[PDB]
Amino acid sequence: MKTITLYLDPASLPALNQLMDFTQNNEDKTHPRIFGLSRFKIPDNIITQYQNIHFVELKDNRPTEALFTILDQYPGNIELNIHLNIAHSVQLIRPILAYRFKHLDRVSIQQLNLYDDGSMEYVDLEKEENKDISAEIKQAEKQLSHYLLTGKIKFDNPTIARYVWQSAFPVKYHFLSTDYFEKAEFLQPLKEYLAENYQKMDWTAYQQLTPEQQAFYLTLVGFNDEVKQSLEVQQAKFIFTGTTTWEGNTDVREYYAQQQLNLLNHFTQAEGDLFIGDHYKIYFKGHPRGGEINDYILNNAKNITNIPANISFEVLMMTGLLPDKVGGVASSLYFSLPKEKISHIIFTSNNPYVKVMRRLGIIDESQVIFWDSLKQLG
């Protein structure tokens, strides 16, 4: 009798897509919505415009028990419209399925919309190169049935399991690279299975919105006039892109900071192996979770312009503000960049990430550079 919409993501790229869906549907002010986005905070003056709007924390890649308190407020027949991170889909839906068990008479799942975490899904798929993919799919379907019927998780192939939701629900997949599913010949049985249930992430969606909706969207993603003006400068531009480590430990985080600064110097100094030229204006776009690694760059480099780390690179493409050249450590941002704009991509210290980028033609056949092979300058 009533639809409720849920938006869930611990990372960056699925949340960016989901905030576009919310913008497209923003005229309806009373439609029930539940936001679980770890990296995005919806501004207060947008929140006040809406009724039946809710928020939930994620812990260990799943909504917390606070979800159940929200759902208890809707005592009629309810249908759930769910948006999810692909790599983390099994854990993110876990508490939703548990609630459904308790209220079988009134709670149903209407549909799923799923979006890539990023490079993770592709590096993971590359590791499956030698397997019988057709057989893997049939087994994953069986094991998904057990999850839906019992509530217990056990998959022989956690990677392939991410792609079999259509056997239970109406679904739509949104991929960072549809080309990968064409070019990886071993994956043909998966492409065939998915049929009409997938599309590429649509980076032209912003252009189709009204002026009012475009402003609404830029507010959601943290884009502001000051950043816009810094990129409208009349000079050739280079953006240095940063990385992070999910290692908590001090020793590794400090090493990443040191090697990343040395890498910057190889682009910007005359004696550097990757010298771009004296005529470029230099920018820094740190990783959203770089933390102290980002601070090390700003503290120890000179003549560099910061772009706030929380702003997703892809927003620059949407707004038509891409620079001449882009360089740094391998990132998901490089998957949707025009090839003319790539300077050098460096890998961290046969490598599956290297293989993925080679298949897609993002890098060529020449020997790749790992950052521990670079001379310590100065």
Ligand SMILES: CC(=O)N[C@@H]1[C@@H](O)[C@@H](F)[C@@](OP(=O)(O)OC[C@H]2O[C@@H](n3ccc(N)nc3=O)[C@H](O)[C@@H]2O)(C(=O)O)O[C@H]1[C@H](O)[C@H](O)CO
């Ligand atoms: C293989 C693997 O594990 N890939 C994951 C990936 O699926 C995803 F979890 C993420 O993707 P990652 O490639 O870092 O980049 C994801 C998105 O973050 C924004 N971005 C990133 C870097 C930057 N300098 N400016 C930006 O704006 C862009 O919107 C981009 O599309 C992530 O944390 O979201 O982190 C990586 C790695 O764990 C990480 O790179 C550390 O090695």
